[PDB]
Amino acid sequence: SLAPEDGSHRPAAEPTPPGAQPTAPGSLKAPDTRNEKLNSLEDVRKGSENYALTTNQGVRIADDQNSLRAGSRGPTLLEDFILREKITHFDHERIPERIVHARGSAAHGYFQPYKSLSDITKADFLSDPNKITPVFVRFSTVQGGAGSADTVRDIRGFATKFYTEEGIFDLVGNNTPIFFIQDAHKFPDFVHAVKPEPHWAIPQGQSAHDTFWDYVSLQPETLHNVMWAMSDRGIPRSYRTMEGFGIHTFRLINAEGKATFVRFHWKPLAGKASLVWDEAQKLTGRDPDFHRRELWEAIEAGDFPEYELGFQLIPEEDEFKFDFDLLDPTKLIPEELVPVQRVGKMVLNRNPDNFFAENEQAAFHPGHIVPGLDFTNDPLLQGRLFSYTDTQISRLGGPNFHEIPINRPTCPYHNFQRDGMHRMGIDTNPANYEPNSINDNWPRETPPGPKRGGFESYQERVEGNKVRERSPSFGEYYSHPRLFWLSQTPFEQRHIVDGFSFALSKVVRPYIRERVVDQLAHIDLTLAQAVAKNLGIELTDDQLNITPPPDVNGLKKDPSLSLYAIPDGDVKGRVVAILLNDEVRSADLLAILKALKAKGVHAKLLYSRMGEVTADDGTVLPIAATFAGAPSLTVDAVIVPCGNIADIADNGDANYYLMEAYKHLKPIALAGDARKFKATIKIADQGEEGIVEADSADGSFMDELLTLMAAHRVWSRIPKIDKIPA
Amino acid sequence: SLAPEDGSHRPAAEPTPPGAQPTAPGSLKAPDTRNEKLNSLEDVRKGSENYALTTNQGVRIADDQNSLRAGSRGPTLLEDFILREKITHFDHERIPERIVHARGSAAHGYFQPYKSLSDITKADFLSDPNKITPVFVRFSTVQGGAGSADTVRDIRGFATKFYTEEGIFDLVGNNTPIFFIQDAHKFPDFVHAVKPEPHWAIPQGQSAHDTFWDYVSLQPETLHNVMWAMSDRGIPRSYRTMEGFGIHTFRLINAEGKATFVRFHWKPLAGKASLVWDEAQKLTGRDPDFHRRELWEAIEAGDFPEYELGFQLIPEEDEFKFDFDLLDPTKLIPEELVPVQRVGKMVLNRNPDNFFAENEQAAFHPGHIVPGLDFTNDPLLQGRLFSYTDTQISRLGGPNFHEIPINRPTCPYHNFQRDGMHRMGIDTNPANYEPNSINDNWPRETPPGPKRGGFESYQERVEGNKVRERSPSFGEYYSHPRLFWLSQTPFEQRHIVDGFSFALSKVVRPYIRERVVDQLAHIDLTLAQAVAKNLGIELTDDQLNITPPPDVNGLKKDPSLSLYAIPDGDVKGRVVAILLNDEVRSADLLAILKALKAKGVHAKLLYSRMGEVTADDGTVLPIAATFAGAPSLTVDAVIVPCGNIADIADNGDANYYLMEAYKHLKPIALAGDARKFKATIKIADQGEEGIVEADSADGSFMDELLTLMAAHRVWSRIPKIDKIPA
Amino acid sequence: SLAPEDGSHRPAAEPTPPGAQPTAPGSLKAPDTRNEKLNSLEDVRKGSENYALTTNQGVRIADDQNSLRAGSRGPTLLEDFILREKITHFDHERIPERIVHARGSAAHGYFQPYKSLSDITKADFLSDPNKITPVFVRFSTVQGGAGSADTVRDIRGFATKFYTEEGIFDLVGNNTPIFFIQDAHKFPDFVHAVKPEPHWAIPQGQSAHDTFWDYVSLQPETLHNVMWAMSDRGIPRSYRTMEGFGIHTFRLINAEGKATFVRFHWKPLAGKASLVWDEAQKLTGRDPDFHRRELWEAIEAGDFPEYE
Amino acid sequence: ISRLGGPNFHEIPINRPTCPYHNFQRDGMHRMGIDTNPANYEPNSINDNWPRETPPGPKRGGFESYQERVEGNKVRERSPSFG
Ligand code: HEM
Ligand code: HEM
Ligand code: HEM
């Protein structure tokens, strides 16, 4: 048999930290993690152990190594139906990728509310805190293909399919609270501008090219979301550490028929955190799967992604109470004006079994709502409602995509629709039309009502002429970008300046850079001048004199728009690199590992080669990777214990390891003679804030390191990084 | 609630004769008829009674009569996701029809062998007389589209999917024992020649046009199957009353590895029976679904179609012992040389629930064989092996067509194939390749053996150069057509002459007619002269002197090639029209109806309007159809009971009903004053064979009518039918 | 007019070195370059300057910035056929990528033989040193998707379509002279092993994972091509500085019917050159389009890729 | 989209306009037209915004919907006048 005698080919079906075990399909890693959707897919899971290899017709194969030929050096024969079926299936494996958000990573989980929301909505999944709704969630980038890298600068999608008892509700959101454009008619133009340019299909996974900034310069409605993308919002550390938003104003409808406007939020219970740009870019080369792998390994470790669902609620009579239009999806609703009510929690606790069958084939669409929710006339939402039904017809092969297992409702579904490519359901109804007598009119319509009723639209009043015209109320483009800019910390603002300066430096036509700097001067002169300086552009006197846009309803900032202004750091699930030497102080290591364990922080033990080293006291320490093999990009903090520091003090790779972690603002902790490394990162004898140092790794040295990790990065180090070459 | 209070909308779930109740889905008409494949479809059967109407996402619908609009006379809104889902599914209901045999009718059933065939084949489904294998059978025409008519002149397909414990085996045959062409490379040429012509797409369901006969005149290999199509074999009475054949020689392989050549047969246990051409052509107009209807209603009545599988077996050492090549599919093996050995019985006993899901999506392919069977080098079979897998990728939408419920095996199937459009199975194997160690190499190959082994091809010797060349052994075209012609009764030979005469009359270019007559003169001079006389063509002295082809292995006829030469008639399931009048002799009708019921012959009571008539003694007689509504075309015989004959004696429809039945050779029985209709059909006072007449329907009147029915038609009447204008 | 007055939006229609001008579609950058295949594509080339914006049915569009709504803050109307055509075409832009070799970069060119090869083959494109055959060439990686990076460690494809006067001949080769496996029946197993693993779809553009090395360790026929892949052959500097091979033995047939066994080679006239691994892996991050860009800009500069 | 295999059905010869048609739509299965436009979006400067919108007018103008007045609530209701 081919597996090793000792069973080391098979991962334990228990939670294990990243790196400890090979990853596995979710039902084999966590067989007793169950939900109603995961149990309903049991009819289509297939196993493998102890079964014979067959054709798809059930014929057992004897030799799966060779084609049928006339003689053993002869021509292959057409009658080889086993070869032809196997190669035909392979030749047809691929389906079209999604037009946007082609790169994504997904998991199963569940949602439960914190209280009944019956007073504001009749949605059944929100009716009782003991109602547990299975979910499937896909996180994604926007521009790149399905084989593009994860840690690009981009908006991220955050789509959740809720399998409710009254239907599937898909909340198809992104990680910023607005979008780039106002009207769905312009979506092909914006997406064509951001995607690879049509002559040569470059660049992949990047907005930093001429056509994107040409469109932005000509369409100032885009500037708000462009500010978010150029911020560190555009480079999240993990899908676990970003916010979600539905963007549009929707409606909640209660059993008395009252409509409330709502915008939806997801708040990450692990907190908000982002990479820095050079780290994100380098990680696209060293691990283009970093966020897919982080999500999968968090769930295999038990560090389940958790989010709180939140609603901003605005009464119908307050529709015109703000100085922006609630229907304009380039405007956000500041939390200082309308707070987020926390409504429930979602936990992602199981990975798929098969990526293609469950993630690639999943179909999310924001028109999939349930009684108790409704739309508004937001003109970007209104066009979305057409596009997701349409695109699924070619991506997933026809109109029966709801029969693909991951998309199936878990509640009953019955109607008079028939046929279509790869129709699975075999209808026995004598009728395929209504009204009918021949089946006593079943399945029957259901009037709307407080529970288990049919869907009726809220009877909004519509009055106007048939026009292709933008509302005048949507014609203000600079106040929300300014509010966002003024809400950032000073280091977040520098990172935004740097994001625009990097991007516009890769625009080849200089007039486009100049037109973007002119737009920036309508938002904030400090930002405009800082970007201009980096491009060698000088503002004109007219530009220096543009009047700043107005505050938003008297606000001149809102700290909820910053990643970092209000502390919300959480270290569970983060990872520290420990740089070993060939004679490690074991007492340093016991102390380190114990304190990390107590906070749920993982460790990775690194050295010069694969294998093991032995500690001063004889403990054998298995090495996970080389310094060069698992770079600092992939960890949150670096600790270097004592022992034979002499042994690594000269290693180019160990030095670079600490230079790169330093440049990227990561906490570094140095014990005993590991303080020799201070010289490579140019740290003064009396120390520096963000470098933890002591004689040994006692319990105090660990608390200080863990406090630095809760604050994510050492922002105060920014003015010091320029003068290490890394 | 729209059903009648009396429950008359719903058919009884019990066997009922044709017309007695509305037809229904098989699992509602016959819920207790079960087999392993029908039970395995339960996971996808969907009911309807008592369920709410929903979208395909499970959202209940309140109003399925209206689109959402801005005001009740306003424009429809794009946000109407319930209208766009319903119309999207409707707009994509169609899939491509099959390239050939697009018109077909299908049913479920089961097969059992009479004894174990373990001495000649290791196929599991033939190993044990107590082993029952579910089947699904589709019967079809060849040329017309899925909306074409059933009783055209054409070859018929007879395809059986056997759901065995060792894999699906599809036996994909037709109703004649040879095909038109020798090498699959010509199949697009032949099928383009018989199909509607490409400029104008005419004619549907007919080979009587110039390109067909141009190809036949240029490719004499076609003449054998053309003879069978021009005979009454081309116009079967029902799928129940035709033979089936696999056409190719295949191999049986036993557990000791011995190969035996085999050709497959189906014998209809209801006997052989065909229409006559004027009746078939007219029936394409009055009921283009006649065979689909007759099949479905026979199964609803309990008149299950039954067939016996038989094998012609030739030892490997006898390959070259005949005047024709066993591998040439334009040659038959006469049963006088190699008898058919009875192997088992197939009963079709349940209709589908949904025609699209089960019939239109079924995929049959003759490359789907099982261990114990193998192919030969027949060059028509060899190209078929390529075509069926290929066509299914576009007809059924991708390479996962085996996951469409009707096509799924009932036995296990596991392999390393993944992905593809509308992938249903979610594989949990950690490996998607072999050899692998990470799942200990499962699923694993299985060596060949006596039972439950892997498939291995028979190690036939191949020797020769790579050539595109027809074997010289295949270059003989006229002997099997002549054997067929000489085996027909004189009335069957007249019907062949009439088939060729009518067909060639529709060929516009007269030189093509003359080239076909010349080919007939190579087969049999009598046939050629009779067709030439009907075409106004005179044979040349050269044609008159062509020497006939040789006998086939000494035979100058083989009666098993005739439909009628050896009586095999069965009356159960046949139907009789009874022509009512407004004061029927109730004693005649009691005697008639119970005689027919005793022999399983159905009746249809006809009159000049719907509703009821009252008999001499007050019995209320319900009318099934009018004389025009249910013409004589649709029945096998006609009975006119006594009573007030003057009610119907001058009814042109009643009179023409008898004239048409008379012309089409059907038995007619006239009781009492119904003998006044003798003048309509010009019968002598002293009577004539084929017309039953007495003073009442008692004594031997019904036995005589039933005797005529068992002989199917009154062939002795053929010379008498010309002196009738009908 | 949205273009700048000075015309600096439009790249010069003449050869210019990398970075000197924005890149452009080839018939705009190099209008004077022609061959028989480029000339035969002219009936489907569509321009743009001075034309009105239309639907695909040729109806001129007045307002391409807004959906049709009932009132300017109202719901979008289903009768907006201009919005639905534009979004429907957008919704259906994608087609499946190639099962293997999905990442690739291509250019037009021409081929000419040095002398007639009629003594060994009757192939018309090889019959006359004056006979010029248009080509279209696509270079590729093997494992990654169409949106993966160029300077991965992988084998590269080198596929040439020759548009001859006796038919299309496709020479579909790679940049090493052997393949990993011996019998096509095993291709899906080998390709499944090298591709991203099926539970989680990682890693992209990399053979450095368990399933690839499990297959290799169990199928020693793979080791030859694995040695090439682990060498600097697996990380070419440019598609211009790698070899090409047809791998298989084919036959040449002359007019007298004689068969000669042949294996096909492409020799880069710019020579052989590879990156080093740390450089290649870092370039996947900093410019995942580096080989597609280098090929396109070499052609816009006149530094045409040449192979023998 | 399903009957004719994708969104380029207007390029099947019988369905093609005989008048000009130019826009920024790209790709799709069996795409025949090879666009040379450097831009595939508007507004653009890189091709001076061509092809360009056309105001409505008496002849050769862009399409504009008649500005019918719409007044009603969002309802799934048959007009009583149709009963
Ligand atoms: C507020 C603005 C929007 C947000 C938050 C949004 C978000 C998303 C997300 C998260 C996905 C990926 C879902 C998945 O993981 O499969 C997606 C896919 C998609 N989006 Fe949107 N989107 C927006 C606007 C639009 C507009 C205006 C259109 C077109 C009118 C559109 C058309 C599509 C299409 C065609 C797909 C691919 C869907 C599929 O193939 O199943 N999006 N969008
Ligand atoms: C002995 C000669 C043949 C017989 C008895 C035969 C019989 C049949 C039958 C009965 C069907 C319909 C199965 C069903 O009901 O779905 C069928 C379909 C078909 N036949 Fe054959 N056939 C013959 C030769 C050929 C040849 C030579 C080719 C091509 C090389 C061919 C290609 C096809 C194709 C493409 C279909 C449609 C299959 C589908 O869409 O699933 N047939 N044939
Ligand atoms: C000597 C070994 C082989 C070489 C040199 C080779 C080379 C290539 C190249 C260069 C391409 C990309 C063509 C392009 O640029 O579009 C390609 C594509 C492909 N190869 Fe091969 N390959 C080999 C073996 C195989 C085998 C054994 C199979 C299957 C039996 C296979 C199936 C494919 C398929 C399905 C495609 C995608 C073609 C398309 O979508 O148009 N290759 N191969």
Element of type H or E holding B286: helix B277-286
C-beta neighbour count of C302 within 10 angstroms = 11
Annotation says A602 is catalytic: no
Q: What is the largest CA-CA distance in chain D?
A: 57
**Which among A591, A575, A583 has a CA at the least distance from the CA of A697?**
A591
Q: What is the largest CA-CA distance in chain C?
A: 80
**Superfamily in which the A469-572 domain is placed by CATH:** Catalase, four-helical domain (1.20.1370.20)
d(CA A147, CA C143): 10
Q: Looking at this protein, which amino acid is placed at residue B399?
A: P
Direct distance between the N- and C-terminal alpha carbons of chain C, in angstroms, rounded to an integer: 48
**Per the residue annotation, which of A174, A175, A359, A655 is the catalytic one?**
A174
CB contact under 8 A, C48 and D64: no
- Chain D contact for A289 (CB, 8 A cutoff): no
**Which among A560, A529, A533 has a CA at the least distance from the CA of A546?**
A529
**Superfamily in which the A573-726 domain is placed by CATH:** Class I glutamine amidotransferase (GATase) domain (3.40.50.880)
**Which among B455, B443, B485, B519 has a CA at the least distance from the CA of B223?**
B519
**Dihedral pair phi/psi, residue A296, rounded to 5°:** -65, -45
Query: In chain B, what residues touch A404 (CB-CB under 8 Å)?
Result: 422-424
At a CB cut-off of 8 Å and minimum separation 6, what does B692 contact?
Answer: B667, B668, B669, B670, B701, B704, B705, B708
Record the tokens describing residue B432, joined without a space.
């998607």
Label each residue of B320-389 as H, E or C.
CCCCCCCCCCCCCCCCCCCCEEEEEEEEEEECCCCHHHHHHCCCCCCCCCCCCEECCCCHHHHHHHHHHH
Reported structure resolution in angstroms? 1.5
User: CB of B382 closer than 6 A to ligand 2?
Assistant: no
**Strand-pair partners of B622:** B612
C-beta neighbour count of B472 within 10 angstroms = 8
Residue linked to tokens 């074997």: B471
d(CA A308, CA B120): 69
Question: Looking at ligand 2, which residue's alpha carbon is closest to its atom 5?
Answer: B173
CB contact under 8 A, A189 and D42: yes
CB-facing half-sphere around the CA of A298: CA atoms within 13 A:
27
d(CA B569, CA A389): 57
- Highest CATH level, class, for C24-308: mainly beta
Neighbour-count burial of C118, counting CB atoms closer than 10 A to its CB (0-12 exposed, 13-18 middle, 19+ buried) = middle
Q: Looking at this protein, which amino acid is placed at residue B140?
A: S
User: CB of A395 closer than 6 A to ligand 1?
Assistant: yes
Contact C136, C117 (CB under 8 A): no
Question: Looking at ligand 2, which residue's alpha carbon is closest to its atom 30?
Answer: B384
**Dihedral pair phi/psi, residue B694, rounded to 5°:** -155, 170
Record the tokens describing residue C221, joined without a space.
């026929």
d(CA A81, CA B392): 14
Record the tokens describing residue A39, joined without a space.
């149990």
Distances (CA, A) of A10 to A24, A34, A182: 9, 21, 51
CA A483 to chain centre: 25
Whether residue B667 has a cis bond before it, omega within 30° of 0: no
DSSP assignment letter at A96: P
Query: C-alpha angle B305/B306/B308, rounded to 5°?
Result: 150
Element of type H or E holding B481: helix B479-487
**Which among A61, A42, A91 has a CA at the least distance from the CA of B412?**
A61
Residue linked to tokens 């062949």: B496
Residue B115 φ/ψ region, left for φ over 0, alpha for ψ in the -120 to 50 degree band, beta for the rest? beta
At a CB cut-off of 8 Å and minimum separation 6, what does A112 contact?
Answer: A129, A130, A131, A132, A133, A344, A345
d(CA C136, CA C28): 18
DSSP assignment letter at A645: G
**Dihedral pair phi/psi, residue A311, rounded to 5°:** -120, 130
**Dihedral pair phi/psi, residue B219, rounded to 5°:** -135, 85
d(CA D50, CA B363): 51
Contact C271, C306 (CB under 8 A): no
Spacing, Cα C98 to ligand 3 middle (Å): 9
Record the tokens describing residue B54, joined without a space.
């929903």
CB contact under 8 A, C70 and A149: no
Neighbour-count burial of A34, counting CB atoms closer than 10 A to its CB (0-12 exposed, 13-18 middle, 19+ buried) = middle
Residue linked to tokens 């036509």: A509
Record the tokens describing residue C305, joined without a space.
């890729």
Q: Looking at this protein, which amino acid is placed at residue A326?
A: L
Distances (CA, A) of A308 to A128, A243, A348, A697: 16, 10, 12, 37
Instruction: Check the CA dihedral B492-B498-B501-B505 and report its sign.
Output: negative
Neighbour-count burial of D83, counting CB atoms closer than 10 A to its CB (0-12 exposed, 13-18 middle, 19+ buried) = exposed
Ligand lying closest to the C-alpha of residue C103: 3
**Which among C139, C153, C151, C212 has a CA at the least distance from the CA of C181?**
C212
Query: C-alpha angle C122/C124/C126, rounded to 5°?
Result: 85
A window 381-400, beta carbon within 8 A of B: 382-383, 385-386, 389-390, 393, 396-400
- Chain D contact for B66 (CB, 8 A cutoff): yes
d(CA A230, CA A232): 7
d(CA A556, CA A550): 9
Query: C-alpha angle A419/A425/A428, rounded to 5°?
Result: 90
d(CA A617, CA A601): 25
Annotated binding site of A: 388
**Dihedral pair phi/psi, residue B576, rounded to 5°:** -120, 130
Element of type H or E holding A264: strand A259-268
Record the tokens describing residue C303, joined without a space.
């530094």
Distances (CA, A) of B652 to B386, B622, B636, B658, B684: 57, 22, 21, 10, 21
Record the tokens describing residue A312, joined without a space.
């901003």
Name the 3-class secondary structure at A404.
coil
Give the architecture-level CATH label for domain A24-409: Beta Barrel (2.40)
Query: C-alpha angle D78/D81/D83, rounded to 5°?
Result: 65
**Helix and strand tally (H, E) in chain A?**
18, 21
d(CA B641, CA B606): 12
Contact A255, A116 (CB under 8 A): no
Burial string for C178-214 (b: 16+ CB within 10 Å, else e) reads bbbbeeebbbbbbbbbbbbbbbbbbbbbbbebbbbeb
Provide the residue ranges of all domains of chain C, joining segments of one domain with +. Answer: 24-308
Taking each helix axis as running N to C, give the angle between helix C210-218 and helix C187-194, from 0 to 180 degrees, rounded to the nearest 10.
140
Cα-Cα-Cα-Cα torsion A534, A538, A541, A547, nearest 10 degrees, comes to: -20
**Strand-pair partners of B327:** none
Contact D37, D59 (CB under 8 A): no
**Per the residue annotation, which of A35, A101, A480, A581 is the catalytic one?**
A101
**Per the residue annotation, which of C35, C66, C108, C174 is the catalytic one?**
C174
Record the tokens describing residue C291, joined without a space.
């080989």
Spacing, Cα C173 to ligand 3 middle (Å): 8
Contact C180, C192 (CB under 8 A): no
d(CA A27, CA C200): 13
Annotated binding site of B for heme: 388
Contact B230, B207 (CB under 8 A): no
d(CA B294, CA A314): 66
Neighbour-count burial of B354, counting CB atoms closer than 10 A to its CB (0-12 exposed, 13-18 middle, 19+ buried) = buried
Neighbour-count burial of A567, counting CB atoms closer than 10 A to its CB (0-12 exposed, 13-18 middle, 19+ buried) = exposed
Q: Looking at this protein, which amino acid is placed at residue B25?
A: P
C-beta neighbour count of B544 within 10 angstroms = 12
Query: C-alpha angle B180/B181/B186, rounded to 5°?
Result: 130
Nearest to C63 among A282, A284, A468 (CB): A468
Rounded CA Rg of chain B:
28
d(CA A646, CA A661): 21
Query: C-alpha angle A249/A253/A258, rounded to 5°?
Result: 105
**Which among C87, B603, C69 has a CA at the least distance from the CA of D74?**
C69
Neighbour-count burial of A649, counting CB atoms closer than 10 A to its CB (0-12 exposed, 13-18 middle, 19+ buried) = middle
Contact A704, A692 (CB under 8 A): yes
C-beta neighbour count of B224 within 10 angstroms = 27
**Which among C122, C111, C198, C209 has a CA at the least distance from the CA of C160?**
C111
Record the tokens describing residue A191, joined without a space.
């997406």
At a CB cut-off of 8 Å and minimum separation 6, what does C152 contact?
Answer: C141, C143, C144, C205, C206, C235, C280, C284
Antiparallel, parallel or unpaired: β B45-46 and A426-427: parallel
Nearest to A426 among B46, B382, B439 (CB): B46
Contact A517, A213 (CB under 8 A): no
CB contact under 8 A, C67 and A289: no
d(CA B721, CA B276): 13
Give catalytic residue positions of B: 101, 174
- Chain D contact for B77 (CB, 8 A cutoff): yes
d(CA D14, CA A715): 65
Label each residue of chain C as H, E or C.
CCCCCCCCCCCCCCCCCCCCCCCCCHHHHCCCCCCHHHHHHHHHEECCCCCECECCCCCEECCCCCCCEECCCCCEECCCHHHHHHHHHHHCCCCCCCCCCCCEEEEEEEECCCCCCCCCCCCHHHCCCCCCEEEEEEEECCCCCCCCCCCCCCCCEEEEEEEECCEEEEEEEECCCCCCCCCHHHHHHHHHHHCCCCCCCCCCCCCCCHHHHHHHHHCHHHHHHHHHHHCHHHCECCHHHCCEECCCCEEEECCCCCEEEECCEECECCCCCECCHHHHHHHHHHCCCHHHHHHHHHHHHCCCCCEC
Q: Looking at this protein, which amino acid is placed at residue A402?
A: H
Pocket residue to mutate for ligand 1, from A95, A101, A180, A263, most atoms within 8 A of Cβ: A101
- Chain B contact for D73 (CB, 8 A cutoff): yes
Ligand lying closest to the C-alpha of residue B390: 2
Contact A287, A342 (CB under 8 A): no
**Which among B314, B265, B259, B316 has a CA at the least distance from the CA of B121?**
B259
Burial string for B402-432 (b: 16+ CB within 10 Å, else e) reads bbbbbbbbbbebbbbbbbbbbbbbbbbbbbb
d(CA A211, CA A192): 8
d(CA C52, CA C60): 6
d(CA B651, CA B634): 20
**Which among A153, A168, A162 has a CA at the least distance from the CA of A133?**
A162
**Helix and strand tally (H, E) in chain B?**
18, 21
Contact B435, B444 (CB under 8 A): no
Question: Looking at ligand 1, which residue's alpha carbon is closest to its atom 25?
Answer: A384
